[PDB]
Write a protein that binds this ligand. Sequence first.
Ligand SMILES: NC(=O)C1=CN([C@@H]2O[C@H](COP(=O)(O)OP(=O)(O)OC[C@H]3O[C@@H](n4cnc5c(N)ncnc54)[C@H](OP(=O)(O)O)[C@@H]3O)[C@@H](O)[C@H]2O)C=CC1
Ligand SMILES: [K+]
Ligand SMILES: [K+]
Ligand SMILES: [K+]
Ligand SMILES: [K+]
Ligand SMILES: [K+]
Ligand SMILES: [K+]
Ligand SMILES: [K+]
Ligand SMILES: [K+]
Lengths: 489, 489, 489, 489
Amino acid sequence: ARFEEQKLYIGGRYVEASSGATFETINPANGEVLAKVQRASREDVERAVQSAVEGQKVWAAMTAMQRSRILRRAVDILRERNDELAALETLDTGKPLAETRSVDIVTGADVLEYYAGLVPAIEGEQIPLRETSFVYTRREPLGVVAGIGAWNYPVQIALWKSAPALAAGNAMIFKPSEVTPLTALKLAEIYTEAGVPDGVFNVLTGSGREVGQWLTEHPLIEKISFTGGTSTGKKVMASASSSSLKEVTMELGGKSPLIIFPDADLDRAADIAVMANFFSSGQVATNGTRVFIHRSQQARFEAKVLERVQRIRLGDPQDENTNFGPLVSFPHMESVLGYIESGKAQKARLLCGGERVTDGAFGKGAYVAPTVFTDCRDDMTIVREEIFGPVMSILVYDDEDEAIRRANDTEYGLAAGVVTQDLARAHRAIHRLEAGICWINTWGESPAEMPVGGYKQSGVGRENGLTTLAHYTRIKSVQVELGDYASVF
Amino acid sequence: ARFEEQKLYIGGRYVEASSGATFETINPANGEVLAKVQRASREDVERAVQSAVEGQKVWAAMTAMQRSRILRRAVDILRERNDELAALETLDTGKPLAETRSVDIVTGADVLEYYAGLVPAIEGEQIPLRETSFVYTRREPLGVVAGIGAWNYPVQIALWKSAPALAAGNAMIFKPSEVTPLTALKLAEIYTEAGVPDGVFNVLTGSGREVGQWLTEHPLIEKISFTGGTSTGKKVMASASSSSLKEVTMELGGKSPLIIFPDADLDRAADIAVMANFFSSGQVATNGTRVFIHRSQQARFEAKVLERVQRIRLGDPQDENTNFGPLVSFPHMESVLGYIESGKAQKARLLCGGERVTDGAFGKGAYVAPTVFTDCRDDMTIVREEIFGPVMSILVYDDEDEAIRRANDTEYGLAAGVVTQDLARAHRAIHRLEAGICWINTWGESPAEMPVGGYKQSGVGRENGLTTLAHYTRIKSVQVELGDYASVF
Amino acid sequence: ARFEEQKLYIGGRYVEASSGATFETINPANGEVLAKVQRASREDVERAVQSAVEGQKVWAAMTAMQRSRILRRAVDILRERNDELAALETLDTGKPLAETRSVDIVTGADVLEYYAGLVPAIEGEQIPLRETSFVYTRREPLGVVAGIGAWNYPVQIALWKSAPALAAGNAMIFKPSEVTPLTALKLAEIYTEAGVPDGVFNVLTGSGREVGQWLTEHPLIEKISFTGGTSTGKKVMASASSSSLKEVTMELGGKSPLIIFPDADLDRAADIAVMANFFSSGQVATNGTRVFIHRSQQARFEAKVLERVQRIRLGDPQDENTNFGPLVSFPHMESVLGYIESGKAQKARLLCGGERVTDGAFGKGAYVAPTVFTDCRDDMTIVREEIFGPVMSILVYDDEDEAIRRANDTEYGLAAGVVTQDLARAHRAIHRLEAGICWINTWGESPAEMPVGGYKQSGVGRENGLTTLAHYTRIKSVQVELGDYASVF
Amino acid sequence: ARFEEQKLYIGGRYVEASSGATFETINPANGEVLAKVQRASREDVERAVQSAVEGQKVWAAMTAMQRSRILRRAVDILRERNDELAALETLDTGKPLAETRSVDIVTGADVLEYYAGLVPAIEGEQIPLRETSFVYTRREPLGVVAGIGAWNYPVQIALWKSAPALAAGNAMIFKPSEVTPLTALKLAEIYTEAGVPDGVFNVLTGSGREVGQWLTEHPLIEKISFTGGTSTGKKVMASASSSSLKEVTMELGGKSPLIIFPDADLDRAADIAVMANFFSSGQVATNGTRVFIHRSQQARFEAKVLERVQRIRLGDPQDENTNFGPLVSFPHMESVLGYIESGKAQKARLLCGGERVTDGAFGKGAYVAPTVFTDCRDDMTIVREEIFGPVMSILVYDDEDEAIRRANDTEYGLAAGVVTQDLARAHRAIHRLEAGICWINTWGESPAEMPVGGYKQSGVGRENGLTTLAHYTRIKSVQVELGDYASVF
Ligand SMILES: NC(=O)C1=CN([C@@H]2O[C@H](COP(=O)(O)OP(=O)(O)OC[C@H]3O[C@@H](n4cnc5c(N)ncnc54)[C@H](OP(=O)(O)O)[C@@H]3O)[C@@H](O)[C@H]2O)C=CC1
Ligand SMILES: [K+]
Ligand SMILES: [K+]
Ligand SMILES: [K+]
Ligand SMILES: [K+]
Ligand SMILES: [K+]
Ligand SMILES: [K+]
Ligand SMILES: [K+]
Ligand SMILES: [K+]
């Protein structure tokens, strides 16, 4: 393998798993093996939890500013090592070096940086009741929490989950996707290097149906934060609930609507549509995979998108000039391809791509071409279901109300967007679109200040923003009685 | 039956259930049949959801102050009908008039009144990103939510759940306990009469394993708030998650510790202990059912408790002089009597009570004497397990840390309290107790301002206070882009 | 005199002033003497102060919800007496009944209602320092505060000032303008009737030459809230500061810019401009008295402005059909005509009005015509100075940065507003305008939720919204030390 | 002159004053002349203001995080140069190195570090009004603000004032005390080196009567924050107000009460009493200069105080073993000595100290001994007036209510504290004390998170805590109208 065997990270160091099993992570750009990775056993989960229980006590016993300084140090390291971490992430995800070098770690560290600064700002409340009595609340750490990551943005997700958790005074046990375990272990080394006490950020590798579930079930873990498919989320949330009533955050899937109004600049709109569909090779949960265009503009719009799509630079992720990589895994390419086939079979009109790219060494990698379907109907499987691949579904509408209604006609509610230049229409439409993450005349930016998460079946809770920090603490209310105590007995 | 048949309440009026079935509700003081009550069918649930969906739109379209005035009027009617409502709650629960007249509606209304005032105060945030882009959040209503109530404070629970839901622009479908459906239907009448749009507060009667589960499963219901046992909550929450990823609030069971430190006034400590065990015949979730007393004060404390217990006025709940009534039902009595038998069998010393009271008219009802066990030990069933009846367990300890360790040694974590005259000990101890609701030198008061709920397996989320109101809304983040849009493609 | 002699209001009743002096208030519509009004002596100020001190204790000893209910009862009485109070304010101000009936008391009560509901939401903070120490803050009432009202919205301003003051648990001594003293006395009666304790809202009649001055100087008064001219504000604040270090809030004057951009609907823009200029006969501090129109539209704009002005229904304020009344007083009419003179003298083109209206009955009142100057220039006295009367100055501009730069070129900064259909321009422009109150495509609406107040020399502090309530309490920080104390000596 | 001549700091470098004048800063330990310092001329003030104006635009043009990173950079530099700055402050103030090394820069930087993390957290609000309209608020920088420093903690004060000002996106012009100009100039360098844009922090030296007043009078400065005597603050505030309605912060004098209740541990009480009187040689505004002791404990308490005072190590500020330095100047020393004489004159019993220390090298410095007066009376000049030197007045009392009434009986109200082991007394007593800064069983600690400032004549506004950052922005409300506009005309 390219790298030595990846071990478990528990208590500020690597330790041997006790499962006697490993799995491989595969570079999707060429099918080669990057590393063999240990599977955590049930007893390894138990070792990580006790490690965290004790680590958390040390972390919590420090002052607010002590925690803040340690996390700012981690940020400093992440900045130093941005390129190196981006390179590792490219190997593990297949994503273009152009994306990983400027996005994954940058915005990951951005969020940690944001929370690091907010540690001393976590406050409770005080409420006078009467002269002889008052209450004050404390916002205590939950204790030991667990994050479970997806494969599309491995270290970013690991940072967005562990940043608020740790900033709130908690220990997090983290499980990356089997598909992409590498950068998570690197983060753990970095946290330790920065001063994060042993046990406070532990990483367990393995499958979700094993270690994932062992985590969601463990009695001592107070909260699960999960990122992945709506279908899987439902199972994960059910188990966190029924085992010990854990608190939960769920960041799930979507089929996010982009509505392009007639008064939009069809150039900006096309840029937004492609960006909302083809960045990270279509592997972004918030993607605007249902694009609504007015009938009077379909033709023109279809022409601008095509022109754009044709200049997309598919190629080796290692190539600085590549801005569109292979998909993350071969089985996922197979899934995506299935969808594109469904499209064809359902008489959706193909506008571009529509097939695997095999020319040359591309055949050794999991490449799918940027694909666009148009003349779509709301009942087509490619329009109802999340593909999580490079597949845009263009849809035609006749009036604003009809478009909003259709945009909302889904069990998903992750993101939504409008392109218009009219003041009233921008706000009017956005207020009516049933999604947690809404964009006006843009797409995809996710500032650390902005709470993001889904409506309906796209999630529970939120990540980022001031609100997310509070949701990593538990409220304790204390009534102080200074006066006499009355009894009816 | 005493009263005419009780029907469903949907869309501002009573409607016929479509199940073909009914159940009876019983006065536990004398076993009298109070009413035949209809069982909501699966299709009745659908009817109620569609009613709520449409009513919620009417309610949300009003202005903040319009909603506030309507809720305040509902508060006004409650004050008028306090006594009438108390009389009804007494019949249905067995709780003394002296409690229902001064606690249940008073404090149910206190919370509605609190939230009525805060409707106009619900706000989102605004964050500048750069000269050319900012974000604002909206706190939008969830839509339709479900409340599932418990039998011990039937109307107060419907109010504590319906107030924040309605104040935040939601509609709520409420299912009272099959054991005590009567006052919840009255609340629904009062809401309608106050101006609450039809469909905004609907009441469905029946069983939890049926109508409750149909509620937790329904895909158009965005949130469940549940009050009941920990075992039940785990099921409810699994159901709410697996079905459609609902938001959840859970107010569950407890085995809350009361630590009486050696510098306590033992008269106050005995008053506190008795109030924390025998109010509402011991049927209060936050009851301090494990009372820790220092070895050196055991005998004196016991004598004080005994003296107070002996003067407790067990009797007919319609008699104003009664301050201790029957349990809620015959099957709950049998449950409590079994716990009592467990305590005798495991060699706890019986300080007083310990049996059913059947003398005179009491034979017709479910009366269990206020009971005190002492010389208890941590491993005893009566100490480990929530009894939810008038059974106090006294436990001797030798030092402060020992007491705190034992107080914390439980899967519960609803409430906790200390009695001490020492400034440092008071706060030191409370800060280390793993419970959501903490009392110093008092017990039982639950101000509308004070967020209440459980640590650990005693709950998920909170009720009352500013924070709770927020958890009845969903965050929408809206990014406005005022400048150019950049595409990498 | 139409009414009997008006007395001081101290301690829940009318009492005789001790000055031996009275002033008259005049109906500006017909010159009728409405009433003689006693002027407070210095000794009367002292008496009002002691009353407020003892009253405030009683008010503050209540529970939050207790204060809330009393303020809500005052709100109910105000709604009952809306028309009656409107009639009286119409007599005293000359403002049209069509205004006083739908605006003054309505929005006055709106704010009191809003604050009524927020009383129980006033909270402090809690902050853990370390295991052995934490801090909590209390928000304590200031004590006795002073309100100084203006003559353009007498009862509304009295409401907007006393509502947050009383809601935060203070007592207020209020001084209405000598010009409009009548309704403030009525509000005092109402508060008493609603349950406001004696002394908590005392009214002292007199002028800024005597009583106003005694209040700002009083050692025992903790805060001054002032509405009036920037010039008077500077004196008031100086006196308030140097005398005893008072908190001050000041709502002062303006010369607010209204920028019509080239893409604006001119019908709306004209609607906006006339409203922004002639409501309450131009007697509104936030009036958009500098209207920027693009050279290309100057012609079409003036036409629509002129068409609207000409249909203004100047007339007797007691006629429901009137929508434009006389000015508040003859001395203020003289001031306004003075400015109209200046505009003529300085060669500004007079589009309409420009003169005292004297036809028939109007000759006995203080009517001035809706006046529009155009072709104005930035150095014109009418363009730089606040007229506070029905006088719109239209300014031509060429480009967007120019209009903004010019809108900003003033020592004022109360309001500003833009008219445009463009999403980007609307926000981009408003963010650059240096005013505390900014309108997009509308004017004048001042929602209870919306903090209002001035940039630069247009004010200090704010009125309305959540933030304002906080400024009627002082912060006390409490550090609790539970651990050891360390000394270097 | 130990150092070269000190120039004005403007626009990122030292520049020449245009006054032609200078003053000397002394060293109170030896009389040495540390430097000559140029007086800023009225035109220099004009210069600093225009520099500030342009710098602010640069600062504000950055992102929140960029600003954050720069202030964190500054913090790092301060930690490095902690000892070196300490040594300089020790020369310019006379305070023991033992203090300056561990307090002045440490806690100065603490506050900067705190606010650096909070820059991104500054947010406005969003308020829906109806389907067609909503408002949002922006918290914009004030612009240019001024700080006027005091001489007891020169660099800490400059940090506490500029930290929030800069974090909120303002430029500050700071004027050190003539008595202690050195460290302020060093901080200006440090900021510039950290990356703070030119103009954002400028230092002008000279008199308050002149340059102080020129700053408070300037029409382009938006706010003044001042620290010094109540007498002067009143003047300063009047000027800031009468000139242009500037927002103001005033941290002023006090005569803070310390109440030792009869259950207090006397050792802890004596330690607190001495820390509260003799740290920084008694030159701290929040000092407990009036110590109330119960009659029953007076003798034992005085004894314990004496024992501690006798072992105080007065000596050379340069020596590491000194914990009690000379006063800040010979003039200030005379003032203190005057007070000390008044005390002798009025027959207070001198427990110890009460004269200058002249033995040896001490005669070359402004050394007053640690002085304790006992048997004081409330009307003594030493009890009524702030001495600002090493003088403790001990006051006997008989009961709690008395002690609280006497504690409150003063026009000051900066700080207060109690010593007691009783939970109820501690909170009850503190709630009744009219001071902004209250300590329980401790004294002196001032967490970055804790808002600190005075009641009554001890101040206006606060320093530190979340609240202070907010008062360095101004609120703009924006109403967005998305529907029709209605005109009565
Ligand atoms: N919206 C998003 O962010 C993502 C959505 N998806 C959607 O999911 C589909 C399949 O991708 P897939 O790889 O299956 O992603 P999943 O959603 O199945 O998995 C996400 C994460 O959850 C873990 N997990 C999987 N099953 C369980 C379980 N039973 N209990 C606890 N944890 C579990 C996984 O571990 P492991 O997989 O290592 O076994 C992984 O870490 C895709 O088509 C895509 O549409 C997928 C990934 C991210
Ligand atoms: K991989
Ligand atoms: K959800
Ligand atoms: K019943
Ligand atoms: K829980
Ligand atoms: K008048
Ligand atoms: K101002
Ligand atoms: K000096
Ligand atoms: K003050």
